[PDB]
Amino acid sequence: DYESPIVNVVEACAPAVVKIDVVKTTSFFDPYFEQFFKKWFGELPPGFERQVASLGSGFIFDPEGYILTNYHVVGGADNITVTMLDGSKYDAEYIGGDEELDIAVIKIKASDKKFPYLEFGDSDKVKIGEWAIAIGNPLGFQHTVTVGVVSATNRRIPKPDGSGYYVGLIQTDAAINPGNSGGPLLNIHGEVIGINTAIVNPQEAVNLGFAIPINTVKKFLDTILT
């Protein structure tokens, strides 16, 4: 009832976690991601592949309709569709982003009322062993959740791609995958401490999940300030 913090956080942050679907006609189609949804989300219409280019998550960080997510998700997109928990659908405008950090901000028109939003925590003050709650919403009408703890900070992983490195990442034993990539990674306090990122496939590996520290995200956001 009230003795379950994690349950509380979700109940509080779920309505701000969105879905992000981008129609085809075509680069952000990294074969790893399409196979994850294709193989695990039987809730995907018969015409997913042909019709979809990218499915992910993201989250509103400020009432005006500003949203964060993974660049690989939205990436260089023309057709961006945002779906919310209440059911309402929207069109987002690619504000800006960065592929090497894999952060990306989006914007949804707020006709009358503003939207619900999450608050940023502080990456520099994260303790290893603290609970982290990953939230996702690829289906739109329901939020998926995985729990774990902070395993390590400032991680560097060579992209199995053989062309770069994922760097500055927060690690968790909370499962992170295309099903919650782009969603937020929270505290027991409801503060966003990172952006769940699945680019780290991870490729038939276990309990190794990663996220982008918000402090890094803040330094990014500031470069796309109004």
Side-chain angles (χ1 to χ4, degrees), residues 37-214:
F37 293 104
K38 185 66 182 305
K39 143 86 162 183
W40 293 101
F41 279 73
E43 305 89 331
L44 258 14
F48 195 68
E49 283 169 293
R50 239 168 131 83
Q51 300 190 71
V52 186
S54 255
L55 178 56
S57 306
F59 56 99
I60 305 159
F61 61 91
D62 268 338
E64 332 82 18
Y66 277 123
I67 292 171
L68 277 160
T69 185
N70 262 161
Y71 183 69
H72 68 239
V73 172
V74 168
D78 55 74
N79 179 71
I80 309 173
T81 312
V82 160
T83 313
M84 269 184 85
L85 251 192
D86 66 23
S88 62
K89 306 216 182 179
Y90 306 70
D91 275 276
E93 199 185 24
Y94 181 87
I95 306 297
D98 186 314
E99 180 204 284
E100 206 62 7
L101 300 164
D102 196 8
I103 296 183
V105 63
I106 251 62
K107 182 63 172 60
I108 263 60
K109 334 192 195 74
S111 65
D112 55 298
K113 278 303 173 180
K114 298 187 173 186
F115 307 104
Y117 61 111
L118 288 350
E119 307 189 304
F120 297 166
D122 187 353
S123 294
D124 299 322
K125 301 270 291 188
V126 168
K127 296 287 187 61
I128 302 176
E130 62 157 46
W131 301 98
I133 318 176
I135 307 204
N137 190 348
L139 299 179
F141 48 83
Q142 183 193 72
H143 50 301
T144 42
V145 165
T146 61
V147 188
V149 98
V150 183
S151 294
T153 47
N154 223 66
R155 291 302 314 302
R156 193 182 208 83
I157 306 84
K159 306 186 179 187
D161 179 312
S163 69
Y165 281 75
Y166 295 113
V167 332
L169 307 172
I170 283 164
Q171 190 188 323
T172 16
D173 45 21
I176 302 282
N177 46 53
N180 61 32
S181 220
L185 187 70
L186 310 157
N187 286 170
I188 16 295
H189 302 83
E191 309 172 68
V192 176
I193 54 166
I195 293 179
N196 310 324
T197 109
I199 26 177
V200 189
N201 307 56
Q203 310 180 313
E204 300 90 1
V206 183
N207 293 290
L208 257 130
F210 305 86
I212 305 170
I214 20 61

